[PDB]
Amino acid sequence: FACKTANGTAIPIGGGSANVYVNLAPVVNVGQNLVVDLSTQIFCHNDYPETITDYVTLQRGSAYGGVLSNFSGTVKYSGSSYPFPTTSETPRVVYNSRTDKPWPVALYLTPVSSAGGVAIKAGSLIAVLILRQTNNYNSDDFQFVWNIYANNDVVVPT
């Protein structure tokens, strides 16, 4: 089991960490969702599907910077939604093919009324999402840590 980003950055067997830089809607109004879809950005596969089945959860999700201070919202994982930042581990997703498959995570963040101007700064860390991988074969329990950075400023009109 291993993963990589759309940019080619890999986290190999056994886990590790990587940086993910994402483009964001440049203007978001109060009450409107800023969508951060990582399913187009993070992909993983199973390295021996002939015998092994891999199980993958969103172990933890944390907020930082302008997201921590200026937004509230949710994370959607494989079709179900939970409060973000997270308070518990999600149910698992099955990986059973060598063909790369999206990690089905997306953030839905809405600006608070009191925010004004630039709510997220270009190049700043906005979130850390931890992928946890186990299997039905041995005692492997590996974590893949994705550090999510903003490519551009996000503006909230007051």
Ligand SMILES: CO[C@H]1O[C@H](CO[C@H]2O[C@H](CO)[C@@H](O)[C@H](O)[C@@H]2O)[C@@H](O)[C@H](O)[C@@H]1O
């Ligand atoms: C067939 O067993 C051989 O390969 C196993 C490879 O283990 C990696 O891939 C598994 C399937 O994606 C994943 O579950 C595991 O955590 C590793 O990422 C290895 O464990 C066996 O020991 C043997 O080498």
